[PDB]
Swiss-Prot record, chains A, B:
Belongs to the glycosyltransferase 6 family. This is Histo-blood group ABO system transferase. Pathway: Protein modification; protein glycosylation. The active site is at 246 (nucleophile). It comes from Homo sapiens. Expressed at high levels in testis. Also expressed in pancreas, uterus and lung and salivary gland. Mn(2+) binds at residues 154, 156.
Length: 289, 289
């Protein structure tokens, strides 16, 4: 549950926070609207685990496996079992056009998986974009009654390290691994004023990755429905955003600031980008071609 | 209002956040439970003002002026008018045993003041401690219906610089100016196990000042009633905490982590402590003896 009476934390022994020592000297750890930017070294996971377990938090994880992308499910789910919200209640939601192609992955206690059959679109762009509509629709069908938070990710990925309750917040986006060091003018936002996703050269905080976002069910419903409705307007006007659902996500998060931002630890491609000094952990990474 | 449907921010032009540049190199700007620690340079006030104005936020400010402390009200209120939540709806609540001694201070538009008559206790310790009971009681009498957030401060103080919506959050405490650089063993927590305020030598995050705390009305009600009930248990057991209400506040905030922590910019004494390099602004300061 969220926003419900909270019991006291028990006695815990851990290192005292150091007021006169920055937790990172190489990166920004808070946005200008006071949202934490989540990097290794910013959080004590023992404190956070206590806070979230005392609230009996349930996390939903959505993934789309349409057409040939069913092949990615086995590694995705196996690695999620090792690294994603371990110790907490988890509900996996696999959206697919092939229910029989979902692998039988052995799950830890307190973790469950539901298969949600959906239609397949012909174009990969529409498969990607229509995730917004489908996530929004299911926020009523079951998410509101079943989970506290939703995490929405790409399937062609694997967990390599801890992804836990440090990410949970009303609304989060993730720094895109290709652009975290780029100036806003270089961001690949939609730049045509005719599109609902339009962002001018002098606006923008970050370039967020379409492959990893989430928050409370209420806030994810708002985000996904807003993006879907914006994509429908674009379609009526005969325009499709340069980076599809990701362009609209970026527009939404510019106008509705996330309450946490995840570092590129949480969305990476090692083949393409290596392992820079700024990343102490690689948590969730692209599966090589 | 809090937690209500939020409209989009308008287009704004401001400097892009720098992912690879820490906003401070000399201080901790986020707690290990991912609560922002509010220092100058961590926030863009233009973004925050937009977010809070769009929600039509009302802030209550409580102050106790009992017996001779009525003399501090004129400067306190005059300086609050220059520096506290300017542009937002404010409701001052002056608790006093002398309604006729409250100075007629000229208020800006959208700002109001209510005088709340209470009893005076003989001992200064009880005057200080019984603030918890009185704040808790009034959370029902009017605060729930009148304000979104409550800020609870000492009266023998003056505003010298901006104190605004950057502090607002469900629950906040403030780093005590005498101890922000101290190790936990040196903190003047209550150390007798017989007291409800007891904290062992190996526990504690920060030493919070009793002179400046707040949050949402719901969370302030919880804090103040918990501290009052704990003080009543102590009284029944013939013990009084070393630093009175401040000892209990520290116990509560250890077990219920605040969602923001304010730097000593927000609670200072220049006569006693000077003006260190770490403080870019002195916002709220003791009135010299
Ligand atoms: O991730 C993609 N789409 C977003 C998500 O949308 C879902 N999706 C998309 C299309 C689809 O047919 N089925 C499906 O389930 C699935 O969950 C995907 O993760 C996507 C779409 C087109 C191409 C690629 C991959 O393109 C490049 O990146 C890879 C990363 O290792 C490889 O380098 C690959 O060779 C390269 O083409 N991903
Ligand atoms: O602030 C105090 N109490 C907490 C609040 O409690 C309220 N209070 C307390 C007692 C009281 O009789 N009336 C009253 O309204 C008032 O709002 C106070 O701000 C307090 C209590 C005792 C002594 C002092 C001041 O002690 C020392 O600090 C001052 C800071 O400049 C001067 O240095 C002063 O000389 C020194 O004794 N403050
Ligand atoms: C100036 C430095 C230029 C170098 C930057 C290289 C990263 C580019 O990244 C692509 O960025 C696009 C937006 O502009 C889309 O988000 C696309 O999905 C993404 O490729 C995806 O994510 C990538 C990380 C890879 O895994 C790629 O294979 C994926 O298809
Ligand atoms: C090791 C360095 C030791 C040097 C530290 C000096 C600051 C001590 O501070 C006192 O701390 C107490 C708790 O231990 C109470 O909070 C007390 O109200 C406070 O004095 C108040 O606040 C102060 C800032 C002054 O304004 C003082 O006049 C007030 O009465
Ligand atoms: Mn992909
Ligand atoms: Mn005082």
């Amino acid at each position: 549950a969220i926003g419900e009476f909270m019991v006291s934390l028990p006695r815990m022994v851990y290192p005292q926070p150091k007021v006169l020592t920055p937790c990172r000297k190489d990166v920004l750890v808070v946005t200008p609207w006071l949202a934490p930017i989540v990097w290794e070294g910013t959080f004590n996971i023992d404190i956070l685990n206590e806070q979230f377990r005392l609230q009996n938090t349930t996390i939903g994880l959505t993934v789309f496996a349409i057409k040939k992308y069913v092949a990615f499910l086995k590694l995705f789910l196996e690695t999620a079992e090792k690294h994603f919200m371990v110790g907490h209640r988890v509900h996996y939601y696999v959206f697919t056009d092939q229910p029989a192609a979902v692998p039988r992955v052995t799950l830890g206690t307190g973790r469950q998986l539901s298969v949600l059959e959906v239609r397949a679109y012909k174009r990969w762009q529409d498969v990607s974009m229509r995730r917004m509509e489908m996530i929004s629709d299911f926020c009523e069908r079951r998410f509101l009654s079943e989970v506290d938070y939703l995490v929405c990710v790409d399937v062609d990925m694997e967990f390599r390290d801890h992804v836990g309750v440090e990410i949970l917040t009303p609304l989060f986006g993730t720094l895109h691994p290709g652009f975290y060091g780029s100036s806003r003018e270089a961001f690949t936002y939609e730049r045509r004023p005719q599109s609902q996703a339009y962002i001018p050269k002098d606006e923008g905080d970050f370039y967020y990755g379409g492959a990893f976002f989430g928050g409370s069910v209420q806030e994810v419903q708002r985000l996904t429905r807003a993006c879907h409705q914006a994509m429908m307007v674009d379609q009526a006007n005969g325009i499709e955003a340069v980076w599809h659902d990701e362009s609209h996500l970026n527009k939404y998060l510019l106008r509705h600031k996330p309450t946490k931002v995840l570092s590129p630890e949480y969305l990476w491609d090692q083949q393409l980008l290596g392992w820079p000094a700024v990343l102490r952990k690689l948590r969730f990474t692209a599966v090589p071609k």
